[PDB]
């Protein structure tokens, strides 16, 4: 809607003109308000996709995502606003602008409507997140990390761009609605195959694929947490959103081209999860868990059965929240002891309890047990996958094994057990910490009561 | 050299290009370049260095031989059609040479080798002027002979200019040589689309000039040169480094930014022609072009190289002699993206 | 660029920088020089010499204005911190600016003007410090590259009087002088100074002073204005450990420099110090 | 490279004062911060937003679909044929080579 989008722009003047020591309150409060306004969008319709201006629309597929994306800003603020303090006022005030500018690009790029507009925003997101990773990440490697985050997107995105232009020349309009209606099959040959990869590879890069995911861990190792929460919880998911969009064309060719990527995914899930079982340091462990779940989304998209898209939507959102949650929840330790390496934390439960509780809830929904929307999101795509091939279950099952283990593992290794002796640094949990993660996890649990509003268009 | 003479030279350069943009007769075009040259060399020789001298030697030597081949190919055209009006040329053996001569005048590869060197030899004033104003006239004639161009020959230099405009850009430290490879790379994008649709060329030209005006005004504003010299500036006048970042990204064509407007119209035009593969390779390499803009961004704004102590006194002293035209040259070269359609003003 | 309306001045004169070379005798040299010339006498232009012209016109703390402190030179010369050099070069930059403060005035009012010590005289202190070993050789190599790069374009020198005092006699006045740090100063160093000073400085410079185009002067006049330009090469990146500063300290100290009332903004605009708001309308 | 010593530490807000609720150094602002953050983080969005979404009108048209489905069940049953067409379109309405 054009109504939600203006105020999101309007916080910027408010940020710059805010009194130097009050800005956090301004940005926080109004970001919360605009979240609540975003929530009214959720209504959708049971038949026709909701429409607005000529240049926007709001499919059910977008709405829960939009609500989420609006919802994250305050969270990143609450996480950030103690991570930085000694920074100069102008620089901080400069800093939140990156975040909000970013979500502005998201609210624009979810409602689309032209796939060229959708693209140019899809790639426009790249800048602020780059700036954030590079200027406010800790340790040296972040510099290098910036590059991996960058070219892997562009090297994917650029051909997609040319492909898009091509279609609006071989057919009429590039607009999504009509192309949903005017859609006509493309088939074999050889030109059409390169069309296929051209319209898939960028989306399959931005949500990491197993053969290509290398940048993602090395982004998460580096980025300051506000960059981490977005880079994990959202951008992956948007790549998925777009790939769900463009599949309105293609067919029947997808039937013939899915196989290689279904192999990289069905194998890469078990593989990356296996690597996930033996990390040195936590902040990476979480990242590989994230890839290990995104593989499920990507096969869920490619088998193209309606159950699979339902499960696609659900898992996208659930993994969003749970991953962001694990990240902030890890940064807390990293700030309390600067260890980063998981081994040093040791008996953290002994010294403070409530965080152990959040570890419990968060990991617990990471492994996905009923009736978490994570789980129910996952079970559908196992169903449709199983319809697609009866063998496939033997792969999915192994996932559900290892995702148990390492998940519980991150719990039992960084918590249960003896305190390290000399680490006096810990200081008994701030209110904002508990507030923050309670803010992640409560929506995630209420949300199970009413799935029917999250399953998306193919409900 | 006193300003009263300097200004007459620079104005006769302006005239020496305007003349190319006016006259229809060929002889007045070759006169246009020829007068342009004589008035271009001395302005490179202000301040005067043992280095600058051989810089001008390079420039003159190549421009002279280029103008020679051009006049020869004109004469051959006349021999086989008895005309002087621009129009179509009537003899391919001549036409390819007019393309070559102009290929030197733009500095397109593999004729390109003089441009990175010459830029090294002169101050950023004369440098900027060389990389913008000199790029007008030869393009001003190519737009007039787009009608008969032998596209193969044009796209080959048009591509190779982009690869060489890439690989030779990853390697250097001191900025001027890098600006040289940036421009030598954009010219590939201009001269690429030229056979297909000139209006896209002129659009891209305008963006390029605006951009390089942004950069060179900034380098002037900070008097940085070698990359390290640029590195110190974050503490003294943080804004301008904090703005070099952006203008660099607009060189890189990250899509919200204005510099994306060229590529994304170009890709359109060529795609109407089919020719689908060429823009894909081209757009992929443009990335490689981006990367050294990024590394250069790392030296500067995003990260703070260690300051030298002596800098502190310099903090007291504001920069002076403000260059009025600058802020607009930044802003136009960045924010203008939702004003592409206005390109049709160029018809 | 406005010179087109007038084709530069035809007037000429000379500035005078007495070269008294001593401790207490340095002061004595200044007194004779001040009385000698109508033009305002050089005040030494030391650590806060820039601060004098900055706008407040007033000295700051040593911490950022120079971060060198001479007393901390004399009390512990050969400090592990390269202050022994950090002062040298910093003073050279300031004295360079001295030139610019006054030579421009020579090209303006056309009046004579009296400098106190000037840049050509800064060769020697380092010339000795290198001999007593207070500074490492690379500090010197940095100093003469920046010397060559910067001094060469300043063309005319001189119109100035060399002088001499006995080393031992200056040692005597030094004893008379009140400051403790001055008294501590070593003799053999100072003798090495006077020796090299007389051996080379006058030996070269007098040959030029013995001789003591308008368009070139106008070009030079442009250089005198916009002083950062005269300073433009003094912040050359060579990264010797004593001069160079890590990003944290610099970002912090400059973050501190803005804290001052007259430095947030260009001087005519600043609201903190009572500049007129009418311009902001 | 001379440089400032090092960051003394992360500094406990608690070191300054017991009770600080994380947030800013200033004791005064923090109370306001947690208050606004809670009042909106819970008491407006997690409730009124949640109740709101809980009572959204059925634009899914689900109940309508149920009722109308009943409406077809009746005629299909009373007339007795045939509940489910095997054909989503009329055969005679479409030509075929």
């Amino acid at each position: 809607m054009l109504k939600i989008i203006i105020p999101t722009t309007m916080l910027l003047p408010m940020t710059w003109m805010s009194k130097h020591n009050m800005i956090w309150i301004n940005a926080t409060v109004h970001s919360l308000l605009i979240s609540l306004i975003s929530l009214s969008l959720l209504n959708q319709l049971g038949e026709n996709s909701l429409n607005f201006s000529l240049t926007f629309f709001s499919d059910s597929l977008s709405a829960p995502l939009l609500v989420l994306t609006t919802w994250l800003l305050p969270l990143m603020l609450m996480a950030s606003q103690s991570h930085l303090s000694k920074e100069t006022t102008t620089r901080k005030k400069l800093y939140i602008t990156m975040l909000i500018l970013l979500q502005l690009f998201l609210i624009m790029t979810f409602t689309a409507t032209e796939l060229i507009l959708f693209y140019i925003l899809f790639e426009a997101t790249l800048v602020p997140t780059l700036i954030i990773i590079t200027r406010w990440g800790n340790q040296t490697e972040r510099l290098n990390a910036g590059l991996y985050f960058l070219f892997y997107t562009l090297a994917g995105s650029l051909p997609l761009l040319v492909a898009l232009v091509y279609i609006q020349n071989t057919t009429g309009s590039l607009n999504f609605l009509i192309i949903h209606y005017w859609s006509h099959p493309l088939s074999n040959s050889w030109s059409n195959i390169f069309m296929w990869l051209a319209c898939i590879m960028a989306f399959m890069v931005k949500m990491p694929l197993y053969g290509l995911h290398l940048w993602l861990p090395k982004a998460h190792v580096e980025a300051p947490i506000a960059g981490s929460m977005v880079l994990a919880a959202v951008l992956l998911k948007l790549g998925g959103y777009g790939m769900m969009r463009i599949t309105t064309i293609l067919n029947p060719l997808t039937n013939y081209m899915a196989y290689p990527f279904l192999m990289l995914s069905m194998w890469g899930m078990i593989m990356t999860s296996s690597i996930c079982l033996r990390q040195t340091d936590l902040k990476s462990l979480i990242a590989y868990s994230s890839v290990s779940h995104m593989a499920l989304v990507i096969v869920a998209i490619m088998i193209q059965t309606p159950w699979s898209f339902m499960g696609a939507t659900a898992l996208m959102i659930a993994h969003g929240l749970t991953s962001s949650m694990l990240f902030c929840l890890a940064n807390t330790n990293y700030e309390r002891v600067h260890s980063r390496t998981m081994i040093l934390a040791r008996g953290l439960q002994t010294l403070l309890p409530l965080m152990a509780t959040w570890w419990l809830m968060a990991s617990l929904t990471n492994l996905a047990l009923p009736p978490s929307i994570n789980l129910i999101g996952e079970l559908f795509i196992i169903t449709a996958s199983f319809s697609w091939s009866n063998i496939t279950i033997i792969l999915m099952g192994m996932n559900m094994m290892i995702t148990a283990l390492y998940s519980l593992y991150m719990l039992i290794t960084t918590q249960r057990g003896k305190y390290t002796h000399h680490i006096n640094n810990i200081k008994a949990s701030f209110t904002r910490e508990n507030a923050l993660m309670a803010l992640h996890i409560l929506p995630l649990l209420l949300l199970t009561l009413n799935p029917k509003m999250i399953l998306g268009p193919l409900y | 050299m006193n300003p009263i003479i300097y200004t007459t030279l620079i104005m006769t350069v302006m005239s020496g290009t305007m003349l190319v943009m006016i006259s229809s007769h060929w002889l007045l075009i070759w006169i246009g370049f020829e007068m342009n040259l004589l008035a271009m060399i001395p302005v490179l020789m202000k301040n005067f260095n043992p280095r600058a001298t051989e810089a001008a030697t390079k420039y003159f030597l190549t421009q002279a031989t280029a103008s020679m081949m051009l006049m020869m190919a004109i004469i051959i055209n006349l021999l086989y059609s008895g005309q002087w009006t621009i129009t179509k040329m009537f003899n391919p053996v001549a036409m390819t040479m007019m393309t070559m001569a102009l290929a030197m005048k733009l500095g397109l590869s593999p004729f390109h080798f003089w441009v990175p060197e010459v830029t090294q030899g002169i101050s950023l004033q004369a440098g900027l002027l060389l990389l913008t104003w000199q790029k007008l006239a030869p393009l001003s004639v190519l737009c007039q002979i787009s009608q008969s161009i032998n596209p193969n020959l044009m796209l080959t230099m048009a591509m190779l200019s982009i690869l060489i405009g890439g690989w030779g850009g990853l390697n250097q430290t001191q900025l001027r040589k890098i600006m040289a490879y940036s421009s030598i790379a954009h010219m590939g994008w201009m001269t690429a689309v030229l056979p297909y649709n000139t209006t896209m060329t002129i659009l891209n030209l305008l963006i390029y000039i605006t951009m390089t005006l942004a950069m060179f005004m900034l380098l002037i504003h900070s008097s940085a040169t070698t990359t390290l010299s640029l590195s110190h500036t974050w503490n003294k006048m943080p804004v301008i480094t904090s703005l070099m970042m952006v203008t660099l990204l607009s060189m890189g064509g990250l899509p919200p930014l204005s510099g994306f407007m060229p590529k994304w119209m170009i890709i359109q035009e060529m795609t109407k022609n089919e020719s689908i593969i060429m823009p894909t390779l081209m757009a992929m390499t443009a990335l490689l072009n981006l990367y050294f803009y990024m590394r250069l961004a790392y030296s500067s704004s995003l990260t703070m190289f260690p300051s030298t102590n002596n800098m502190k006194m310099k903090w007291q002293f504001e920069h002076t002699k403000q260059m009025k035209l600058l802020p607009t040259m930044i802003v136009l070269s960045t924010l203008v993206l939702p004003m592409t359609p206005a390109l049709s003003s160029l018809n | 660029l406005g010179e087109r309306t007038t084709r530069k001045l035809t007037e000429t004169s000379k500035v005078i920088t007495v070269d008294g070379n001593i401790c207490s005798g340095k002061g004595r040299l200044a007194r004779e020089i001040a009385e000698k010339l109508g033009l305002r006498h050089f005040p030494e232009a030391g650590i806060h010499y820039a601060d004098s012209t900055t706008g407040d016109g007033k000295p700051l703390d040593v911490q950022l204005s120079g971060n060198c402190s001479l007393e901390k030179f004399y009390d512990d010369p050969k400090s592990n911190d390269g202050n022994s050099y950090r002062l040298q070069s910093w003073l050279y930059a300031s004295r360079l600016l001295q030139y610019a403060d006054a030579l421009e005035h020579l090209l303006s009012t056309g009046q004579g003007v009296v400098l106190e010590r000037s840049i050509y005289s800064d060769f020697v202190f380092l010339e000795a410090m290198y001999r007593q070993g207070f500074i490492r050789k690379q500090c010197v190599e940095h100093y003469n590259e920046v010397k060559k790069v910067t001094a060469c374009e300043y063309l005319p020198p001189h119109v100035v009087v060399y002088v001499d005092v006995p080393v031992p006699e200056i040692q005597s006045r030094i004893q008379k002088k009140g400051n403790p740090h001055e008294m501590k100063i070593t003799a053999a160093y100072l003798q090495d100074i006077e020796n090299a000073y007389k051996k080379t400085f006058l030996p070269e410079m007098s040959e030029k002073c013995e001789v003591l185009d308008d368009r070139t002067f106008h070009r030079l006049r442009m250089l005198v204005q916009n002083k950062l330009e005269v300073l433009n090469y003094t912040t050359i990146p060579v990264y010797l450990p004593e001069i160079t500063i890590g990003a944290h300290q610099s970002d912090r100290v400059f973050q501190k420099f803005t804290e001052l009332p007259g430095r947030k903004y260009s001087p005519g605009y600043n609201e903190d110090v009572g500049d007129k708001w009418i311009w902001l309308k | 490279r001379l440089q400032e010593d090092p960051d003394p530490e992360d500094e406990n807000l608690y070191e300054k004062n017991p009770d600080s609720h994380g947030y800013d150094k200033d004791p005064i602002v923090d109370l306001w911060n947690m208050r606004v953050v809670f009042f909106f983080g819970f008491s407006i969005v997690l409730v009124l937003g949640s109740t709101f979404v809980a009572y959204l009108p059925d634009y899914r048209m689900q109940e309508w679909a149920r009722r109308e489905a009943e409406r077809l069940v009746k005629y299909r049953e009373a007339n007795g044929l045939p509940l489910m067409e095997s054909n989503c379109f009329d055969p005679n309405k479409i030509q075929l080579p």
Partner: peptide, 19 residues
Amino acid sequence: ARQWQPDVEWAEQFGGAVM
């Protein structure tokens, strides 16, 4: 965790005539 800003050995690599 005092950020990380580039060291001398880092900056020297750009200091050559050609990277």
